[PDB]
Amino acid sequence: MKPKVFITRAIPENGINMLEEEFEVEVWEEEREIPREKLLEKVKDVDALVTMLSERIDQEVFENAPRLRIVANYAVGYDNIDVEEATRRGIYVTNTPDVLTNATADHAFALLLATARHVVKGDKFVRSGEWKRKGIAWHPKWFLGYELYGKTIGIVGFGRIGQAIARRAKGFNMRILYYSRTRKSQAEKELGAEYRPLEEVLKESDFVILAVPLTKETMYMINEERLKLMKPTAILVNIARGKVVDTKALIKALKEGWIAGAGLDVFEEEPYYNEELFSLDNVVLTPHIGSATFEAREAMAELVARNLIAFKRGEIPPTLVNKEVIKIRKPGFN
Amino acid sequence: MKPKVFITRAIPENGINMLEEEFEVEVWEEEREIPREKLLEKVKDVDALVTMLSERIDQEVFENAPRLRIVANYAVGYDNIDVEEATRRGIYVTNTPDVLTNATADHAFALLLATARHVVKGDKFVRSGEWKRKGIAWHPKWFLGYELYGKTIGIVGFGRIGQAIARRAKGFNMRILYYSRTRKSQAEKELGAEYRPLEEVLKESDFVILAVPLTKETMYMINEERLKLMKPTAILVNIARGKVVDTKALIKALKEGWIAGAGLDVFEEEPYYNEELFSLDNVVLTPHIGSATFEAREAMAELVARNLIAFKRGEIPPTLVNKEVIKIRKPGFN
Ligand SMILES: NC(=O)c1ccc[n+]([C@@H]2O[C@H](COP(=O)([O-])OP(=O)(O)OC[C@H]3O[C@@H](n4cnc5c(N)ncnc54)[C@H](OP(=O)(O)O)[C@@H]3O)[C@@H](O)[C@H]2O)c1
Ligand SMILES: NC(=O)c1ccc[n+]([C@@H]2O[C@H](COP(=O)([O-])OP(=O)(O)OC[C@H]3O[C@@H](n4cnc5c(N)ncnc54)[C@H](OP(=O)(O)O)[C@@H]3O)[C@@H](O)[C@H]2O)c1
């Protein structure tokens, strides 16, 4: 008698418990991701879905889900969902902005600093015993990295996470440039940031941070010609999506010294293995953990629940991504 | 006819070249550190020394250096120099403050973030191919770390580097507490920082950063009872000196979950190997590279040269650490 939601992953219990008050809830509890054929089977009679970036919510899913009215992504990105087709069908799509902004902006800085200061390579040198075995405490030319103070940070995608990365950069006294679809004077005045065309941001920055969604417009925007514009001392950080960067071109740039290093949280396929990329000591790698804090987790689970419960009550969900759907079908289950 | 300086390491050429205009210069150029017996031989007829933290400038060095009038440490720390004995003897001692503040404060944040967000462990997971081999792109419970935003940072040693770490923490919207020998209202008002007794800082902080010199008073100040006061979710960062922390107690704290993790740039002996410490995935380790930026390097070399040249000219050196020596012997060579 309650509407039915399938949750494709073991998200925090707080969100599951909130949903159990208002829905019949099914939760995929396994460590492994749900196989595609099982996803298609399980959506047969669901009114709602909570999905991860690992599930491709495309036309084929919709065709196999005739009761589905709302998809809540447990993520701020939604490049895994065919939102135009959802809108067509009157299906509401929600995401999780804001509650993971600080985690991801912190992780961008974690990657920036780790890459700039040789933290991963340094740790291996110590931890392996090589430092002790070689017998040399310190040398003035070892492990030299790059300053941030007074340097220019270039933020590609000046949204929630991009602005939060700029806020952190102000603590390092950085000159802040950004490229975005829009220009925002509030954030400009609060942070001292300045808009420039993309190729100017790439030419003038000491650190380039990617914080855009994946769309047709941002696919491979960091390509071979764009990388050639960057400084040979510059560090690239990708916390956005893997396919914003042409990895083949990035490998060439790193090997040939077109840029100095890269910190990457996201990859063209996940999981990822690339022997050539992974052989480089001027890259730092993390497995798509930008939003991985206990608190962001929990807050994302609450927010997915709030969206689905608002929808049940005939309210517009607070983090609806496809507002055009409202005029197509009003909220609620039938 | 020019005074003679021995430089114990291959510091940047800019500083060497400045000194060659005014001194007969000898530079130890080898990768390895100068052996103790060679140090004692080489100081026999020097008027000045430029030393690294690796050289122990103690009474025995002074007794073997009868012309020595000034020691310029290529470091801000000077726990490797017996400054009281230098003063006694009329020997000026200088260091390198300021020019390495931003490098070291950046590295403190590099270690804080790497430890809080599992950057080293994450990189090994990806780079080794384990992420790919296990076949799972992402899991909501994997690699969960700690937020900074709104959290409390406790700075032990509120000097040049400690205040610069607080400046960076303001970009993360942190509540800033500090313990120091003094209280500083300027920095309090600029950064919103508040003084507290040491044990209160340890109890109330989510991140504890050590930025004190090594002195009799700070030796093993982070001991077993102090570690027990910390939060089980708290992260410790040591960019100060290894002997500020009782490593045996720190290992117990990390294994027993008294604190959540530690980022360490400095060790009780350097180089260092500790199999038990190095087996822990909740530690991040770097080989005393806090000041290792190209620019800090260069600026340290210039500053050592400026000190020795000012002294030659009968001027008080700009970063003299033992001001009492001035009344003992005026500056210059004879
Ligand atoms: N690595 C991780 O763990 C992780 C975690 C969270 C998010 N992410 C990813 O980061 C992305 C951004 O997150 P967010 O919350 O900051 O989203 P957001 O607030 O929508 O910000 C994205 C910004 O990118 C701008 N943008 C979009 N298309 C662009 C284009 N073609 N050219 C230039 N700028 C463009 C957007 O412009 P407009 O102002 O015109 O909107 C917006 O300012 C998500 O979409 C996601 O892919 C990754
Ligand atoms: N890891 C690295 O690569 C690296 C690089 C640079 C420096 N260091 C180390 O970091 C240390 C600090 O550097 P810095 O330039 O910030 O020096 P600093 O300006 O002298 O600051 C040190 C601060 O520690 C405070 N302090 C000293 N003794 C204390 C005590 N017993 N209790 C509480 N606070 C005490 C000092 O108090 P007062 O205000 O009363 O002076 C001062 O505020 C150096 O001495 C060095 O050991 C490490």
Taking CA atoms only, the protein residue closest to ligand 1 atom 27 is: A212
What does the alpha-carbon distance between residue A293 and residue B320 come to, in Å, rounded to a whole number?
Answer: 46
Residue burial A109-144, b: 16+ Cβ < 10 Å; e: rest: bbbbbbbbbbbbbbbbbbbeeebbeeebbbbbeebb
φ, ψ dihedrals at A155, nearest 5°: -105, 120
* Helix, strand, or coil (residue B269): coil
Instruction: Give the residue from A282, A291, A273 showing the smallest Cα distance to A252.
Output: A282
What does the alpha-carbon distance between residue B83 and residue B70 come to, in Å, rounded to a whole number?
Answer: 11
- A211 with A108: CB under 8 angstroms? yes
What does the alpha-carbon distance between residue A11 and residue A19 come to, in Å, rounded to a whole number?
Answer: 12
What does the alpha-carbon distance between residue A177 and residue B22 come to, in Å, rounded to a whole number?
Answer: 44
Taking CA atoms only, the protein residue closest to ligand 2 atom 20 is: B159
Mutating which of B13, B74, B277, B286 best tests the A interface, going by the most A Cβ atoms within 10 A? Answer: B286
Total residue length of chain B? 334
Three-class HEC string of B284-303: EECCCCCCCEHHHHHHHHHH
Joined tokens for residue B158: 């509120």
- A209 with A162: CB under 8 angstroms? yes
Given in angstroms, what resolution was this structure solved at?
1.4
Joined tokens for residue B125: 């997971």
> How far, in Å, from the CA of B16 to the mean position of ligand 2?
27
What does the alpha-carbon distance between residue B312 and residue B314 come to, in Å, rounded to a whole number?
Answer: 5
Ligand 1 atom showing the smallest separation from residue A217 Cα: 31
Q: What is the CA radius of gyration of chain A?
A: 22
* Helix, strand, or coil (residue B208): strand
From A270, A276, A315, A324, active-site residue? A270
Nearest 10 degrees: CA dihedral of A300, A301, A306, A307?
Answer: 70
- In this structure, which amino acid lies at residue B16? I
Joined tokens for residue B245: 């922390």
φ, ψ dihedrals at B244, nearest 5°: -70, -25
* Helix, strand, or coil (residue A72): strand
Cα angle for residues B245, B293, B7 (degrees, 5° grid)? 85
Instruction: Give the residue from B174, B176, B172, B175 showing the smallest Cα distance to B156.
Output: B176
> How far, in Å, from the CA of A212 to the mean position of ligand 1?
3
Nearest to A109 among B113, B141, B145 (CB): B113
Joined tokens for residue A95: 């995401």
Residue burial A184-216, b: 16+ Cβ < 10 Å; e: rest: beebbeebebebbebeebbebbbbbbbbbebee
Cα-based distances in Å from B245 to A228, B39, B165, B267, B269: 46, 29, 19, 9, 12
Neighbours of B159 (CB within 10 A): 20
Pocket of ligand 2 contains residue B240 by CB under 6 Å: yes
Instruction: Give the residue from B169, B168, B193 showing the smallest Cα distance to B179.
Output: B193
Give the closest-approach CA distance of B1 to chain A in angstroms.
Answer: 30
Contact check, Cβ <8 Å, A136/B293: no
Experimental method: X-ray
Residue ranges of E strands in chain B: 4-7, 24-27, 48-51, 70-73, 92-94, 152-156, 175-179, 194-195, 207-210, 235-238, 261-264, 283-285
Nearest to B9 among A114, A117, A140 (CB): A140
How far is Cα of residue B55 from the mean position of the Cα atoms in its chain? 15
Residue whose CB lies within 8 A of the most ligand 1 atoms, among A163, A178, A180, for a mutation test:
A180
φ, ψ dihedrals at B62, nearest 5°: -60, -40
**Residue listed under structure tokens 């941002």:** A218
- B211 with B192: CB under 8 angstroms? no
DSSP B24-93: EEEE---SSPPPHHHHHHHGGG-SEEEE-TTS-B-HHHHHT-TT--EEEESSS--TTB-HHHHHHTT-EE
- The answer for residues whose C-beta is within 8 angstroms of residue B248's C-beta and 6 or more apart is none
Q: B27 pairs with which residues across the strands?
A: B7
Ligand 2 atom showing the smallest separation from residue B158 Cα: 43
Joined tokens for residue B264: 């360490």
Domains and CATH numbers, chain A: 1-97+291-334 (3.40.50.720), 98-290 (3.40.50.720)
Joined tokens for residue A17: 């418990």
How far is Cα of residue A328 from the mean position of the Cα atoms in its chain? 30
- B172 with A168: CB under 8 angstroms? yes
DSSP A307-325: HHHHHHTTPPPTTBS-TTH
What does the alpha-carbon distance between residue A287 and residue B124 come to, in Å, rounded to a whole number?
Answer: 10
| Annotated binding residue A145 | no
Taking CA atoms only, the protein residue closest to ligand 2 atom 46 is: B77
Pocket of ligand 1 contains residue A104 by CB under 6 Å: yes
- The answer for residues whose C-beta is within 8 angstroms of residue B156's C-beta and 6 or more apart is B162, B178, B179, B180, B198, B201, B208, B209, B210, B211, B212, B221, B222, B240
What does the alpha-carbon distance between residue A249 and residue A227 come to, in Å, rounded to a whole number?
Answer: 8
Q: Is A113 on the interface with B (CB under 8 A)?
A: yes
Q: Between residues 199 and 238 of chain B, which touch chain A (CB distance below 8 Å)?
A: none
φ, ψ dihedrals at A57, nearest 5°: -100, 80
